[PDB]
């Protein structure tokens, strides 16, 4: 595939140009990564200019959909919105080429919306470092906002939360996601309304122990109804007043260039992996050290040693 | 150095075997750590009878002297407590003045390693030494500035956090990524006097705070507490509590169920050394990789880039 075309017709937003060279991102071959690693390197100064918000939730109430509603909200007002989804058990899967876009009904039929699903790697470091030059090509292709959701029932909230530049959490009316929050979000705003309302002023109580790690924001707790649509778009204003604060001192490229070394050598450490698991004897050996280690046979520096050696 | 002899009285309680077979772990070279690390190997069997215990806060909050006191009290009871420290400080190189002379007692230093990975991975190493030399509490502490609590979390069984006495407009708060670690918060210098009035004031706050998030169920609900640990206050019902902790997850399995995840970490940590160690083997590569990183870093060049322009080094 020519790869000087590619990038031309994805800096012109051509979607199906932005999904070829994403795939190419994506893929488990090593050939395919490497042509598509100095297209990035290319378009590097054409990203950045989004933002970068992680969504996590409670299993059971409106996750997708307060997403869709979210969403098409800010397609309406003249936005192009990528929403990635980060799932730790395609580190046991090969990922998914349809993915699953019409949980989300409105944007799945969205010219604005892009909808990918969590990519496949030997490591959820890789997952989530895989996850991030996706958003940079998304970037360079326009895409101003980037969405990033939690999609497993797996653990993948701190991953997300280090790829985005503001984590929203989303609760009803785990104790890690509580200190990750820039904001929560309380679903299922009149009935309800007095149930939403008071639990929002319950997590506000709980969030108050907590010291933010920046004095340029305080976490506030807001109500909505994604269901109809309610509070959006002053969820979505606190999230702005967020960038345009932290942008002023500096601390979202601060903490963005914090995220791309982390996800520097989490691929590092998943090409490591993928050499130990990449032919059966090795793939045997390491299995049988981290056995021995986690059944208290061997040490962890007996383990490890046995590893350094079939390297 | 012989390593038959020196396992057998490590195992009898042998403080000077102790003390030795730890200067060969700490040495920064093979031949030393590889002998080391059979000894080890070899009495993993006679470890992990013992309570472990991370302890972090402030600098200034009273965590040494707390320490002091909280040993002192264990090794009167005929505990043997080790004490040591988690400094990521040490990746670039007696103050409990009691236990420093108690011989029930036994206190070392941060190790030096080139990760933070490492430094706690060397810790995990001296804790099996200890545990196989009869200790029966390991108390391991965060020192510095640094972001060591994750790793001292990852090396015991119960995470211990000392706080200051503030209370309305000058609460501490819990520093992010603490919160979900601490399975218990002590506010100290509860002294006679205002002390103990505006320690409970804050340790009231941040109990009504705690409960909000938080059920009935659940092995282990996080108390607060107050202590003053100059005065030797509140101390024997914090130990309680540590102690209750360990009975109710030992009957769910969790305590071996949390120690078996942490063994693994630490093996794929010292993984994660020895790669580090080739990256700054020599000036020529340290460079290169500390050039991939800036490019990184300065958004010059991608993740990715960076990680293949590495992967090349190795
Ligand atoms: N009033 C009072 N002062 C204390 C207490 N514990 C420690 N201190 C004092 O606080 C200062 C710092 O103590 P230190 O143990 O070095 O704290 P660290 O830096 O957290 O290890 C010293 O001057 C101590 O005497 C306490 O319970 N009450």
Redesign the interface.
Known sequence: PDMDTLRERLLAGDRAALARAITL?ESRRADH??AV?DL??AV?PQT?RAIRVGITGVPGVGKSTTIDALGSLLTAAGHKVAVLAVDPSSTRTGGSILGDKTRMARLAIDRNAFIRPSPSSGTLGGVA?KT??TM?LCEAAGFDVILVETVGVGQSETAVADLTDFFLVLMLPK??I??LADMIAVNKAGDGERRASAAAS??R??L??????SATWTPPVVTISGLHGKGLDSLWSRIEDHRSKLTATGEIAGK??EQ??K???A??????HQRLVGSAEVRQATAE??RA?????????????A??TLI
């Open positions: 991102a990564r490497a690693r990035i390197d590097l950045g470092a991030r030059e940079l104790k890690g509580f200190e319950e997590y109580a709980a108050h122990i907590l010291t933010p790690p963005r260039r791309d070394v996800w520097m050598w691929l590092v450490h998943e090409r490591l050290a981290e280690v986690a059944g208290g046979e061997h040490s962890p520096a007996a383990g490890a040693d590893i350094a």
